Design a protein around this ligand. Sequence first.
Ligand code: A1CZD
Ligand code: 1VU
Ligand code: BTN
Lengths: 69, 69, 344, 135, 271, 172
Amino acid sequence: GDAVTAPMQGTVVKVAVEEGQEVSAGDLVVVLEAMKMENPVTAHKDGTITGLAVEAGAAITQGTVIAEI
Amino acid sequence: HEAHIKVLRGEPTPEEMAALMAVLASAGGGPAEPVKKERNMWGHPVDKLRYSVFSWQRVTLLERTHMRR
Amino acid sequence: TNKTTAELLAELREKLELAKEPGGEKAVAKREKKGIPSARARINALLDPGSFIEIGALAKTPGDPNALYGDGVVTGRGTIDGRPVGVFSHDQTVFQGSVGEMFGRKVARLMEWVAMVGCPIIGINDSAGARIQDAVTSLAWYAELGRRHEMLRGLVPEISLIFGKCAGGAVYSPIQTDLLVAVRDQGYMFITGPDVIKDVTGEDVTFDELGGADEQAKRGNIHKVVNSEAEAYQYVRDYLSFLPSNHFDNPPIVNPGMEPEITPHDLELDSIVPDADNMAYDMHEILLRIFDDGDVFEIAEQRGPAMITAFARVDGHPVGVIANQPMVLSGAIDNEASDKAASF
Amino acid sequence: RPLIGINDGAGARIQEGVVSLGLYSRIFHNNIKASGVIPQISLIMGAAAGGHVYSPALTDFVVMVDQTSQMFITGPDVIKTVTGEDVTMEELGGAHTHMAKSGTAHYVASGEQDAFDYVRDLLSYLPPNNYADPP
Amino acid sequence: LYPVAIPEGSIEETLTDEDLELDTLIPDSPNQPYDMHEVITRILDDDEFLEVQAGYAGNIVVGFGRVEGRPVGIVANQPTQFAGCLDINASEKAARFIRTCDCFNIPIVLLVDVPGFLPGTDQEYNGIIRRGAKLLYAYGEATVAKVTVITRKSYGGAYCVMGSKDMGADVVVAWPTAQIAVMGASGAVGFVYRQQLKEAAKNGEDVDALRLELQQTYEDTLVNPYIAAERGYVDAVIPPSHTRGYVANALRLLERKIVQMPPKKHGNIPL
Amino acid sequence: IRFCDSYNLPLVFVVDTPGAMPGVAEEKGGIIKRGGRFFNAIVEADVPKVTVIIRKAYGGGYAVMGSKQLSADLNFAWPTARIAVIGAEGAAQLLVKRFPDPNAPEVQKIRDDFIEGYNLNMATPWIAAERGYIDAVIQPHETRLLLRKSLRLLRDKQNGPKVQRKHGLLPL
Ligand SMILES: CCC/C=C/C=C/C/C=C/CCCCCCCCCC(=O)SCCNC(=O)CCNC(=O)[C@H](O)C(C)(C)COP(=O)(O)OP(=O)(O)OC[C@H]1O[C@@H](n2cnc3c(N)ncnc32)[C@H](O)[C@@H]1OP(=O)(O)O
Ligand SMILES: CCC(=O)SCCNC(=O)CCNC(=O)[C@H](O)C(C)(C)COP(=O)(O)OP(=O)(O)OC[C@H]1O[C@@H](n2cnc3c(N)ncnc32)[C@H](O)[C@@H]1OP(=O)(O)O
Ligand SMILES: *C(=O)CCCC[C@@H]1SC[C@@H]2NC(=O)N[C@@H]21
């Protein structure tokens, strides 16, 4: 759907996007440190980064919306 | 050279002997005709198994099961 | 705190080059003073150039700080004349080549490999005594190795090269194999050495009289005796050139269809047998003429020499030839001629 | 002949190296070879953790004890660390959980003698192997 | 088969630059993931990989390719998805793929980079015990050629599941970056030194720095391929670029495997 | 052993041997190939194989007399068993080959101290038991009923995996 969502509970160590940025499918959107892996989370479709809902350093819970696209 | 019944303690009278033997003879339940049963290998389990083309069990299980008599 | 992928790969390359000479210079010195080649150099000389893939080069005796890589044997796979073979080679620089736990497990893994792939196995044996610091482990692993011949006997061709004093328990694995080739004055094979014979039974006996290559060939424990390791390698290549890779597959067909007409060499046979029945002659003068060429490859020449057991080819297909030798003992079938023919 | 395993152990012995993982691999491989050849029954009579769970899973019948026994791959402390979920070891791996939810247990005995009675009843229907005639 | 112009010489003599690209592929930090397709497409011929079921259980990649013209089934952990942990769905995906290959004599190659099974109560309640054992059964039953390449992590029960040697992997090779251990050093030190971490806690010492020191000592001692190579559970530790040569050799030799399993009508795989 | 295997008789081994007999006459007599045939027959046989070790089981004697390594099914030892590569006197002589001045007074002392230590610590049941090379150490009186229980268990033994083929070759 119209949501990039956190696949697991983790600590945001990077947000790779800006509000209003155009992103292609497969673009990196965030990095979550979880399970001792800096997991990339990527845009599942072409779109525009809107409603971005992360900032660096925060722990975020599984299923949290990270951005709309 | 047969194994006989033995009475180890006391002596019964002939009447008590007859009653003892008569009830034990009645307790002698069974087929009334114990003989080697008819062989019928149709659908025997050993035919159902998968044997590798080179499996030694083709000798020591399958064949011996069929040929043993 | 954490080494980079480049540093880890450089460590690997250094560790592999160390594991190519686990004994270090202190054992290299004694090996080269004895003038014998290394266990890997022997494999490299036997196999086709660069074909060798080594299995378990970094194995070590478990839990022992003293352990050295390889545990005393080099094991792996390659090709001879482009055909797969398994090979193992004892390495007397590590624990004298004594049979340890990981030695056993490595050779057992190789035997299971060649039994699964269905290809010949060559064992280059030169020492495999009990490991003095843990001899009852060697006792267990001699038997664990002996058992896995159950997978190989009559399924894949087995070869033993006897390049040293094969003594004690070390004899009972080679003697299961199909072909033993020994190097003269270098290969020896015996259960109980001269010293233990002397002090248990009083007899005097030299290594040659006890179990030298020529003696064990005449006794029929060795199938070939050669003057050098290179001759042993070539004899193995020739032997394998008459055989399939396993019980199931076909042998190679070499030079089929030659000489389809009656030749002068055929017509020479009409007069080869001498006129008088008391005469004798070398049977090779017949054998060299009745098969496709002179490639009559003889096996166990010295055992029961009244009998010839050889490979030959007919229309390019290999055959086993059993022939009497009137040149020796009038061709009577002695004890060893009988058992030689039965085995072949 | 049938094989009964009574399982009760904290997984691999951590001070021993990967050798424990080699032996676990060989145990699983034998349960797979025997699978469909002989009746394999697993009793679970304590906390089976980590490697100790896949062998029962590969056997034919798993019998558990109501609240004395548990099975789980990953312990509660690791689940808490990764996912935040507080769970008791009984709620995570209890016999009631593996009966009602996971479907891994075949019987939940009230006690160890009841478990043995169920294992004897089970064996009473099965042949000793896939080619013997049944009783 | 396709006929292929196979080069001649040793493996190290016959390396392509596309092979040398493997030597630098693994990131220097063990927290960094990489796309396993970067390995798969380099070991397969022509980069040509037919991925099967690509959109499901992305933590494991499975599919077909060719090595020197011989078809192979790749199964490979995917570090970018759930850190490569095995879960229920990946286990069923890989079990069905491995059994489909073994039915049709297609050999299988595992590329292993798994930290363990995915934690969570919902995995237990959905039956990870019952359903992960499907991948154990499928791999142990498979009698086609099975080659394992270990590329970083292979831990715990997931080491057993991802084609360990005693599960009958015919060739197991490990890259220098492999990490084979019972469990992560953070937990292992928290177990094997829980004694000394009591003594230090009673002494009021900097137990956090002591944990870091013990964890470093454990990682430097044991979290490497060499302990498994020493046990002979890894047949060789190899430069990553040798991977294609070792696979091609194994799959050429094991084209017929003379192996068998005890007679049965069929097995009893967990369902 | 080959005859018993052909007619499916279970095999019971009752070991008490120092192994192969040393001597040049025995070497010339073929002891390597004859022993290799004995080793071949024990591994080839498919019948149930049970072993009881009494007293000495040294070296090739241990191996060939139905060791577990050579495919024996169940292995028992009486507490008198002595399992080793070589007997104490042979190990002592192998040590006295070094500093070999057997006329000396002290060497005949350290010999006996070594033999005492070797017969207490090495040539015993206990290393084979703790390593699991033998399955039980038993009171001697148990043997008859233990053999009944064992061969009843093994009654249906199927040997495998084995690859069927024309035949297995043997030293000849
Ligand atoms: C359907 C198809 C089915 C078919 C399937 C069928 C197939 C299945 C088949 C199945 C087959 C079953 C296989 C079962 C295997 C047999 C069981 C094995 C166990 C034994 O049965 S038993 C082990 C072996 N073991 C001893 O006995 C110790 C007692 N022993 C002896 O019985 C002898 O005597 C002898 C010869 C062995 C000992 O020989 P030596 O004493 O080792 O030799 P040496 O002293 O001359 O030289 C070396 C020593 O001296 C030092 N040394 C001298 N010179 C130099 C120098 N120049 N430079 C450096 N160091 C030197 C050095 O340190 C070293 O030390 P160390 O003494 O080796 O530790
Ligand atoms: C396949 C690889 C794997 O699965 S790695 C498995 C790692 N497992 C653990 O870390 C278990 C730690 N907690 C546990 O004790 C066990 O999980 C369970 C089943 C809960 C038992 O708990 P409980 O009955 O309270 O025992 P406890 O914690 O008091 O420990 C008692 C003694 O057991 C020992 N123990 C336990 N597990 C292991 C193990 N895996 N390796 C080595 N030792 C182990 C403890 O060290 C302790 O020893 P001691 O009695 O304190 O001397
Ligand atoms: C790290 O801080 C310890 C917790 C993470 C443990 C990882 S998660 C994925 C693997 N599965 C498991 O049980 N432990 C491993």
